[PDB]
Amino acid sequence: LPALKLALEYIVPCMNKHGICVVDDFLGKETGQQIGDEVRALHDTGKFTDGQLVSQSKDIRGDKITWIEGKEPGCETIGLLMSSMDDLIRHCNGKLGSYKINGRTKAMVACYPGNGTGYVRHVDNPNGDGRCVTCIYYLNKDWDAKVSGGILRIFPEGKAQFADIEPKFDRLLFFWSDRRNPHEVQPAYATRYAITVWYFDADERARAKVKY
Numbered sequence: 587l588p589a590l591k592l593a594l595e596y597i598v599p600c601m602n603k604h605g606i607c608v609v610d611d612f613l614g615k616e617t618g619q620q621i622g623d624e625v626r627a628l629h630d631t632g633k634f635t636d637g638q639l640v641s642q643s644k645d646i647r648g649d650k651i652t653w654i655e656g657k658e659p660g661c662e663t664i665g666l667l668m669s670s671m672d673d674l675i676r677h678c679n680g681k682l683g684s685y686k687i688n689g690r691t692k693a694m695v696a697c698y699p700g701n702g703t704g705y706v707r708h709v710d711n712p713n714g715d716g717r718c719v720t721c722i723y724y725l726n727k728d729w730d731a732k733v734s735g736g737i738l739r740i741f742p743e744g745k746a747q748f749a750d751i752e753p754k755f756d757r758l759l760f761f762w763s764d765r766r767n768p769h770e771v772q773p774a775y776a777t778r779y780a781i782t783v784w785y786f787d788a789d790e791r792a793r794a795k796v797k798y
């Protein structure tokens with residue numbers, strides 16, 4: 587699908603009504619794997635962090651991250667993922683809420699190591715830091731959450747219920763970054779890779795430059 591069709595027939599009507607959207611088979615199996623390769627090559631070559639400190643001798647650590655600009659050697663299909671997320675957002679064109687989305691972060695590549703850690707419930711942006719849309723791309727080939735866990739559970743707020751989102755291969759996830767969408771990753775018992783880019787609201791981002 588061209589970014590424009592997906593954006594206007596799906597992303598926008600979905601985001602404005604539910605505030606969470608899932609695009610399956612986003613880039614297709616060939617490109618999907620290429621990203622998998624590049625992400626694994628980052629892991630294998632020691633670029634990831636530490637890991638999130640879950641339990642504070644031999645402590646327990648969680649998701650490792652790396653920021654990727656997209657032009658790095660060995661990171662080109664990720665760069666290309668990013669450009670294609672950017673195309674989607676641009677073809678929304680101030681149709682996402684009242685938002686004027688003028689920029690974004692580098693890409694946070696995440697590796698959950700499969701040691702039963704998840705990510706405690708959280709709000710990507712609680713204090714008004716600029717971030718208004720969270721875009722996540724999952725690269726997990728033949729993921730079974732019944733066996734490996736790692737489901738992402740969102741608590742869209744003002745709602746009795748949650749939405750469980752499996753970190754399926756070639757899945758792309760959009761959701762409002764603020765207090766409307768509290769979420770968590772359930773414990774992952776297998777390596778779980780994801781890539782996140784956050785989109786900035788012009789105004790909120792513009793005010794945050796002085797406050798932080």
Ligand SMILES: O=C(O)c1cnn(-c2nc3cc(Cl)c(F)cc3[nH]2)c1
Binds near residue numbers: 705771
């Ligand atoms: O892979 C996931 O499904 C997932 C869901 N939220 N999450 C998560 N990682 C994050 C990292 C940072 Cl620095 C942050 F500020 C907010 C974050 N939110 C990852």
Ligand SMILES: [Fe+2]
Binds near residue numbers: 708709710769
């Ligand atoms: Fe998050």
